[PDB]
């Protein structure tokens, strides 16, 4: 591209570094939901994968994103803290 101006596409639903430290693989959904609340995306047909996915566009080049998923099992017990970065 060559444009000098660019506003920023901005959405949260992230989880902080404090938010990861509250929880653990094994800590159940409710037990996570007391620490982290609900996600703004869960696995909508299968398991309880609580997606907390940050997405942000900081200008012309570069994209910032924190895709955190929380695959709890069917028992609610967490099986996966997938704190996946941008891209």
């Amino acid at each position: 591209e060559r444009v000098v101006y660019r506003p920023d596409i901005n959405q949260g639903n992230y989880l902080t570094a404090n938010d990861v430290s509250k929880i653990r693989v094994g800590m159940t959904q409710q037990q996570v939901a007391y620490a982290l609340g609900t996600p703004l995306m869960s696995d909508p047909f299968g398991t309880n994968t609580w997606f907390y996915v940050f997405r942000q566009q900081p200008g012309h080049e570069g994209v910032t994103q924190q895709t955190l998923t929380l695959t709890f099992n069917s028992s609610g017990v967490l099986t996966n803290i997938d704190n996946k970065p941008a891209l």
């Binding site: 995306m41 909508p44 047909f45 994968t49 566009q57």
Partner: protein, 218 residues
Amino acid sequence: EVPDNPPNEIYATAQQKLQDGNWRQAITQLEALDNRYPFGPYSQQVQLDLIYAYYKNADLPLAQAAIDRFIRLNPTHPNIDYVMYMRGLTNMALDDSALQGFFGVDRSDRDPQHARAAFSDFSKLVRGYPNSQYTTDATKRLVFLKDRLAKYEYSVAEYYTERGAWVAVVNRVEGMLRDYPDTQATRDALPLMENAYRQMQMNAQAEKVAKIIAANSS
């Protein structure tokens, strides 16, 4: 106005301008009863004929108040099935305001609140009165009336795809999912949530939707 006659002579002159199609003076003479004899027995039938006057006079919100009047006057009546049909039929004709219906810019990307109100009353006809002659028609209206909001919610799912808030795109497709499966636009939204997955790099979760795409390629 209230041209006050005897109540039947009101009612006859209430009935005549309906047969003329002059609803404006039918309404004037149907008002001649319900202001002089609201204790009149066919004030209910006046309220039914007022909807036959108003809606055909393009006085659809005045029909809607006359719809709620016959509902408030008769919580029970075997002519509510006309009215509960006419209720959503008002609330679907509450939609049309301008000539975007010709241009393909028709109101299924627009304000749905009367249409969702029409979805209630059309179904409140078919559930409250399945015995009606009006029932399969409102059902046929209800067939459209999931799909008016489908392309409307697709227009939202269009927007957040343009916005690129792929967290939100999943949810608008999810609302497109959880309400209506029998809209192709939801299966047109089936790549779009799967799109939003891959833009958030949920390709395998998109692959789950690709299997749904592979299933709903049928």
